[PDB]
Symmetry: D2
Subunit: 386 residues, 4 copies
């Protein structure tokens, strides 16, 4: 049949893959090669980036996002830069959300302008700010959603109409949702990018990225962006592992989301916790938008602990099961305290303008028994807050 | 001791590597992870791209090229672009050899100018052309040597002095030589780049690149170029395989060079072969320069077969052992006929301005018995030339 | 803490694993080495099979089965033979279930007797037959449950008491259940073995086995059985993949079992299906025993289609989503018709004595949407049965 | 053509391998699968162990040893036991060399007799002892050569004639030579086995074994020995790495042998060294036999240091480049002192009956510059011997 006709779990398992024609091997073979051979001069000319393993991953993700074609990359950052460096040149303009991944922010704020490409940062939770910042030279509107670190949302369908009316493309980073929870292209986005490093692979052992969009664009991203600009090839072994990890995407996302809701409710009920940011809680500022745009509220939670900086340090130093790390989207529950860890070299007043308060903790909820995670949190919080 | 003190074969085997401290495992473990964990908030802050497997490869190649530091990449193209996009910005200028890898040529001729970065192409076999093209805005001189497809040479030491006098850096693509045959940094180059896809890995199963240079530069290439521009990470599995492949670099290069000399002499003696391009033959235009600059003449050969385009096609369609492919630097002998294969979509008169004649064949000599390769060639040539 | 204290899902994720001490890498490093180095002669003597990756897998499975120690092997068959060849010698006796894996049957019926080791086969669904077959020389009672191909059950606790009273050990093949659905050691078995090739790895890309039991036994299985008899080492890469696959064991088993129940009910309601064998259906002969012994009824189903041999062939030749294969326990739904496929070289009357009727179909239910599987089955059945 | 027609280096590179038919991939794909799918019931029956990657390795090694067929295994020990447990049953007899690998000795001395299989150990350097020990029940003569730890030799051709005249098969462990240095089947042996863990893989990152012999035997070793007895499957990833490692077998063996000869001569000239055992030295007891039977004398050396046990300890504790390890046949130079390390739990007088004197050092010479190894040895010896 055609894999675009089956239910979503069936697509997760099967799309882009088939038993090996010549051997019947069911697993996609790892084509760990750099060299492909021709049968003849003619065969070689006719042919005149490409690998069967990576192709299977690209086709699968294209199906899952409901896009025409996929392109794998060496990293999520390379998926973002290959895309934007393919689309933009000296004199072009980009309108970007402000609440985005920090390294994306550095690329947009420092790298692009040095190539003659200007960027305007706006609060993408306010579509009007996006409209106001558009220019005749604007090629791209770039957004992330949910956005960290307070899990605020962006109304993709609305922003898409705005960008399109002014002749720009919409690019959406769908990393934190995965195709299982959100499909930006179905809401009008033109291009979706992911760090597969997170939920798509899910097993914390692959760095990689993926871009999905129209065939016309993807061909340019491949034959110019990858080939002639970033060189950000995904290795066939990484692609194989990502295919393997993605087989369980549906069941992992269900369990991540189930666990995260329970933990979020526990945190909301806890007197030592001042705030809890999780789209699955009714008290969330854009709760209804989230209900329409996302099939599930996700596995990521942020929260503020009473007592600011020192409480945040005490709490992370007191967990026994949760692991301290800056990654998110793995099978293990991961936790971090940006102010004391990643952003301590930053000015307190400046961190605040990023939405990073001294007491903010970020939590990636894993596949453990939620009771064990809650017990670990409860224990650490109690220790941290007297 | 210090691995920088041992003979070159000893460095090939040992540099950058040591038994695993905690387990004693001799092979460098494959750290196939995306997540690293901290023991504490303090430990996490202190720390504030990086992987132990990839680090071992980078350190090894730094030792072999006699440079301070190494940086692995997703591909040879990404080693080149990460380097040049790190060094250059809008308004800057590059002077480049014309006889370079085609995809490098596309990046330099089309991508860079679209970012406000101008490139002048020159015949790098003539150092005076390099000097003449220098401008106040010139940041970089870029060269490849030997250069394809006629294996002409560039006098690295001379070009280095010229670039430096005018305040530019010299970047050298050392792919076709490997550190075993040529060390550009010892001749004055500031930065060396490789596609490890060729001889450094040597086994035709890895796409990857490496950059070697001063610590100050490599840090910028890593924390800005890779992190904030190309995203061209090498996967830890690729790094492991490359470490494994490089263990035999010395013995592979010796045998490649021994075999190539024998085949080159056979070809030079053959009445159906009009020209043979191989630095190891005295008849080579820059033979003496090659003798001073290269420890060995290399494994790559180009030659012209009598009867132009159709003879070239006939010959490649008649080999039985040599494999038709556009790659070079593997254990198997590889052969290609650019005019009928890769460059047939190109204009005959334009190909010529690239140095690609209708009868030009390129040969990557592998580890087979040279007698078998010669027999295969002799058979194919005879068939091709009546 | 101690991983034996956490809930079962938490153990699945965490048991046997921890971030790498020296680097903090969260994924267990792949120690793909054959060589370990000593710091000194003394250090080498003190030390006087073993690999850190494989150790992590062995420790994890030991925790999940509630046994003292684990031992990984090159295959499920090697887990079984390493165990039994470690325990038994010339003149010893084994009492075995008759309804076991065919290749196990061949080892027991032909190999063992040629080594002076006698085996009596019995219907293990009848504990009295086990007792009756015991001899003074009986070292081992061996059983599988559920047993194929009709998914009949064996009362582990009862058989354990019988074997022990007569001084024998009980060995249980727990492949079809996994530790998530059944824990034989908690019911009195002394040793559990698995083909990890099925549910424990779950991704159809690893052949391997595991043995769990007391430390005293496992040491003998390791230093004599593996080292001095079968040589059935698991490679560290296989162990790594198995660790990776097992991370999702809980969520995979839940979904396999949920899907299988739905499909089993559909089949039971279908007029072209004469019988359906699935422990989750009340109509199953040992339903209550299954309820006490198994947390879930499993992902495997057998059923008989109307019209015997030719109907069975027609049906398997008519599925479009289910894949034809002799494996079971993967993410994809797999189907087979033993009589027309694997057992067609066998005598019809003999197949019957194995419980293989002409219309028997075996189904391994995967992670696809159950609706899609049911539609595929419904379509194939209808075609097969007019 | 037919790969059995090319020179030996050409076979090393090419035999058993070809570009992937469907994709043209030159590297043998890693078929990391446990599941193979059928197109139909008929196709499934017709078919009624096997993996395309492993098949390529088996075919290659069969070509290199000039045997009909190959069978890969989980380890060298499993290659030996799968072979002998396939050939022998209760009441059968084996005549074995005494100077063999210790773990082989344990299998033969303890395991086999417990299965009703008797073994007689003899000094295989004396063919007459082999003849004298033959019985009507003798199925197999088993030998290793060179034999450790004094590198004594066995005259394969002579022993083969003796075994055959009395109706037995000759099995030869060719691990220390590799097919590049010795081909037992060409000298009359019926079956060759290797630990590929040593020179065939060569990179110290694979444990595995291989068996080569007639198709009739190999089929039994595969479908009964592996399938129904040891279960000692080689994983497809291990097979791929072994194929990769073997590509450089010719050039590695040449360099190992060149380096070992230089080191052996240095040691023979050294006044603190009492004896040096290396077939490449004229002073070797069976020098001429070695010249006829072996193309090269090998990479392994044993020697005795003045001052017995304590000198041996001092010397190994004083090397700075050589690595202490019990492995041999890697790219790094490895060294060990059996008496102080591996065999210190053994009785001094008993070690001697094994040929292990207190001063015996074993050295596996790697690919480093021989000058560096010699300097390291010279330094350690001097320190060790005042
Ligand atoms: C929302 C988001 N987008 C992109 C990236 C970059 O993806 P990498 O380069 O694969 O790490 C990250 C960070 N992982 C992220 O959190
Ligand atoms: C001299 C030279 N430099 C760089 C490259 C690019 O290296 P890749 O991206 O790893 O293929 C090539 C082509 N392989 C080349 O021949
Ligand atoms: C119940 C059962 N036990 C053991 C085995 C053997 O395990 P392999 O050697 O890893 O295939 C099988 C068959 N896979 C089986 O179905
Ligand atoms: C001559 C010889 N034969 C067989 C073996 C066993 O091979 P493994 O099981 O792959 O280690 C060894 C020891 N490596 C050996 O030295």
């Amino acid at each position: 049949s055609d894999c675009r006709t089956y239910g979503f779990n069936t697509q997760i398992v099967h799309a882009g893959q088939q038993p090996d024609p010549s051997t019947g091997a069911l697993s996609t073979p790892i084509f760990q090669t750099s060299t492909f051979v021709f049968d003849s001069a003619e065969q070689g000319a006719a042919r005149f980036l490409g690998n069967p393993t990576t192709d299977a991953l690209e086709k699968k993700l294209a199906v899952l996002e409901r896009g025409e074609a996929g392109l794998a990359t060496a990293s999520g950052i390379s998926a973002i830069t290959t895309t934007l460096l393919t689309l933009c040149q000296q004199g072009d303009h980009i309108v970007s959300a402000s609440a985005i991944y920090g390294c994306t922010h550095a690329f947009l704020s420092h790298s692009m302008p040095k190539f003659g490409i200007n960027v305007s940062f706006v609060d993408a939770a306010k579509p009007e700010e996006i409209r106001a910042a558009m220019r005749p030279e604007t090629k791209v509107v770039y957004i992330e959603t949910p956005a960290n670190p307070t899990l605020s949302l962006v109304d993709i369908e609305t922003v898409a109409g705005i960008a399109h009316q002014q002749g720009a493309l919409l690019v959406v980073d769908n990393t934190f949702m995965s195709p299982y929870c959100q499909q930006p292209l179905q809401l009008g986005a033109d291009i979706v990018v992911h760090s597969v490093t997170k939920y798509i692979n899910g097993h914390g052992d692959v760095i990689g990225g993926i871009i999905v969009g129209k065939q016309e664009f993807i061909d340019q991203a491949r034959f110019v962006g990858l080939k002639d600009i970033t060189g950000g090839c995904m290795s066939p072994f990484n692609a194989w592992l990502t295919l393997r990890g993605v087989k369980t995407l549906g069941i992992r996302m269900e369990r991540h989301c189930e666990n995260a809701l329970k933990i979020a409710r526990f945190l909301e009920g806890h007197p030592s916790i001042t705030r809890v940011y999780y789209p699955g809680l009714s008290s969330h500022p854009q709760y209804e938008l989230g209900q329409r745009q996302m099939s599930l509220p996700g596995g990521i939670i942020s929260f503020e602990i009473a007592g600011g900086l020192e409480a945040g340090r005490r709490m992370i130093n007191s967990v026994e099961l949760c692991l301290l790390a800056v990654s998110l989207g793995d099978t293990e529950t991961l936790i971090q305290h940006p102010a004391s860890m990643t952003h301590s070299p930053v000015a307190p007043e400046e961190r605040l303008k990023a939405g990073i308060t001294d007491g903010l903790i970020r939590l990636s909820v894993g596949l453990e028994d939620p009771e064990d995670i809650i017990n670990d949190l409860e224990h650490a919080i109690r220790k941290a807050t007297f």
